[PDB]
Amino acid sequence: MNTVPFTSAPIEVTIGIDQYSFNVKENQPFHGIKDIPIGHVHVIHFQHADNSSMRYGYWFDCRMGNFYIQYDPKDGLYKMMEERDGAKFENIVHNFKERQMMVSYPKIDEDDTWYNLTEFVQMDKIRKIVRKDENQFSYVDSSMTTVQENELSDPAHSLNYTVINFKSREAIRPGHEMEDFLDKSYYLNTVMLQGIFKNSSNYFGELQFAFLNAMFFGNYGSSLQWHAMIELICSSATVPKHMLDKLDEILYYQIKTLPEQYSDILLNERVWNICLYSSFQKNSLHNTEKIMENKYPELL
């Protein structure tokens, strides 16, 4: 079990850690989060009490380094940093643990939610879309745009998701226009899975990451990427049977976890109705369809 130490909390802020969140008051004696499950990526995120504009945070993996949070009063945010001196760090943590100034990551033993939301999410891969190579952790916020959004303006601060575009030469073989536009299996299996992602795990990982950035930061371009990647599979007549079973699980747990009051914005009516009711895979998402109908029957 690992620990992320906070130098202090000088501004009132709501702190997220994965799917959990807690309020910290201005100058409250808070010094971080302990008992973080090793083995998963994690995200630690922030929403200042004064300016609920800009949710922001940091993807990290405690196996890759000793990471801490310190407020920067010049840039006005909680920054993640790496402590390279291992003993300086162990000693910082031990003192704050002894003084019981840390919140415990509150995982119910029965609860596989975070595993289930991050099953294909690795951390070296995350950094291939959030490019900032001097750090082992990755910053994301509400307002970052994706590479594809910028095509339609600062490149260093973009989310380099895989561009998917159903009306592109990439998606459409010459002479197979109708075929490839109405059944996207070629684009899914040959172009994306075999070509770009290499395997279903890289497809699922980007897709799971897109979802989490949409939910945690209200990042709109992530939300677009998550829908696109769902739509490409559902609109393919030929999908490996293991991928559909796994997709049904992935989406189930995403839909399960979404705040009930954010469905209006984070869920695209056209995509979901097409995927659950019109598409080739309309019968292949039993768990996802059943939770969507019981939790959000209005959207449909």
Partner 1 sequence: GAMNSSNYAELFNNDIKLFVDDTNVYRVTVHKTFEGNVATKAINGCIFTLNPKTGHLFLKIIHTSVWAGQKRLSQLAKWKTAEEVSALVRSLPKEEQPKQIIVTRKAMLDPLEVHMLDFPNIAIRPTELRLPFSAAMSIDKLSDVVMKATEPQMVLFNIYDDWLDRISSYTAFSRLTLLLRALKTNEESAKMILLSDPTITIKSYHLWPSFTDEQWITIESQMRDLILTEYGRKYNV
- Does the CA dihedral 126-131-135-140 come out positive or negative? negative
**CA torsion, points 94, 99, 102, 104, in degrees to nearest 10?**
80
Binding window for ligand W9I (CB under 6 A); candidates: 42-50, 205-213, 246-254, 261-269: 205-213
- Specify the stretch interacting with partner 1 by CB under 8 A; choose among 45-53, 129-137, 146-154, 167-175: 167-175
Of 180, 206, 231, 289, the one binding ligand W9I (CB under 6 A) is 206
Q: How far apart are CA 223 and CA 211, in angstroms?
A: 6
Burial state string for 122-136 with b = 16 or more CB within 10 A and e = fewer than 16: ebeebbebbeeeebb
Residue 117: name the closest of 204, 54, 203 by CA: 204
4 binds, among partner 1, ligand W9I, none (CB under 5 to 8 A by kind): none
Q: In whole angstroms, what is the distance from residue 227 CA to residue 267 CA?
A: 8
Subset of residues 61 to 120 that bind ligand W9I, contact rule: CB under 6 A? 68, 83, 89, 92, 120
Q: Is 169 in the site for partner 1 (CB under 8 A)?
A: yes
Return phi, psi of residue 138, to 5°.
-125, 120
Report the nearest approach of partner 1 to the CB of residue 75 (Å).
41
Q: Kindly state the smallest distance separating residue 177's Cβ from ligand W9I, in Å.
A: 31
Q: Are 204 and 193 in contact (CB under 8 A)?
A: no
Distance CA 38, CA 36 (A): 6
- Segment near ligand W9I (CB under 6 A), from 16-24, 200-208, 247-255, 259-267? 200-208
Q: Which is nearer to ligand W9I, 81 or 274 (CB)?
A: 81
- For residue 78, the cross-strand partners are 71
Task: Give the H or E element holding residue 211.
Answer: helix 200-217
Closest distance to partner 1 from the beta carbon of 270 (Å): 14
Among residues 24 and 92, whose Cβ is nearest to ligand W9I?
Answer: 92
Closest to partner 1 by CB, 104 vs 168, is: 168
Considering only residues 179 to 198 of the shown chain, the ones binding ligand W9I according to CB under 6 A are none
Please report, as ranges, the residues that interact with partner 1 according to CB under 8 A: 167-169, 172, 177-178, 181
Please report, as ranges, the residues that interact with ligand W9I according to CB under 6 A: 5-7, 68, 83, 89, 92, 120-122, 125-126, 129, 201-202, 205-206, 209
